[PDB]
Design a protein around this ligand. Structure first.
Ligand SMILES: CC(=O)N[C@@H]1[C@@H](O[C@@H]2O[C@@H](C)[C@@H](O)[C@@H](O)[C@@H]2O)[C@H](O[C@@H]2O[C@H](CO)[C@H](O)[C@H](O)[C@H]2O[C@@H]2O[C@@H](C)[C@@H](O)[C@@H](O)[C@@H]2O)[C@@H](CO)O[C@H]1O
Ligand SMILES: [Ca+2]
Ligand SMILES: [Mg+2]
Ligand SMILES: [Mg+2]
Length: 144
């Protein structure tokens, strides 16, 4: 949890999520556009379901120091991103780190710092019932 590199290594990587609704493709959270208005097409959306999740494959194991989430901003539904974990997984898809968050507290973004963790996947997992996961962008930075 000290300095991080400036390059967003999640941009343009393979992304996936638990389901897709309202056209909100998982790749919208790694398209290099943090615009949080759903109508501008750069925010993801899963079904309303239990324990929705979204993941990016960094494509190799990297030493991750920071993951920045940008929430949806339009429609007074920003609170759907609450009671969730940010998880780092190794190449074998085992958990190597996990942090839980109750809220973003109305902030547009959350910066999550990891202590130099070697991981290939970054996952956001909701812990709530019957709630869709929408992210405008997830950016990931290596430890410096
Ligand atoms: C009609 C269509 O093509 N899609 C609508 C959704 O409307 C589109 O996307 C919205 C976010 C706006 O950009 C809207 O102008 C656009 O037509 C529609 O979403 C609701 O749309 C109303 C306006 O009609 C409000 O914007 C509302 O906040 C939207 O609902 C929210 O966003 C959705 C994507 C879901 O997450 C809802 O649960 C939210 O409450 C959806 C609305 O059900 O229906 C499509 O037909
Ligand atoms: Ca985006
Ligand atoms: Mg507009
Ligand atoms: Mg893959």
């Amino acid at each position: 949890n000290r300095p991080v590199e400036t390059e967003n290594i999640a941009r343009g990587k393979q992304a996936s999520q638990s389901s897709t609704a309202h056209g909100g493709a998982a790749t919208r959270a790694v398209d290099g556009n943090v615009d949080s208005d759903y109508g501008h097409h750069s925010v993801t959306h899963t079904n309303f379901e239990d324990n929705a999740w979204w993941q990016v494959d960094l494509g190799k194991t990297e030493n991750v120091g920071k993951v920045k989430l940008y929430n949806r901003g339009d429609g007074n539904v920003a609170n759907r991103l609450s009671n969730f974990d940010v998880v780092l997984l190794n190449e074998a898809k085992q958990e190597v780190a996990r942090q839980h968050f109750d809220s973003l507290n109305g902030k547009a973004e959350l910066e999550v710092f990891f202590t130099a963790k070697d991981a290939r996947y970054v996952k956001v997992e909701l812990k709530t019932k019957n709630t869709p996961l929408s992210l405008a962008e997830v950016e990931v930075f290596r430890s410096a």
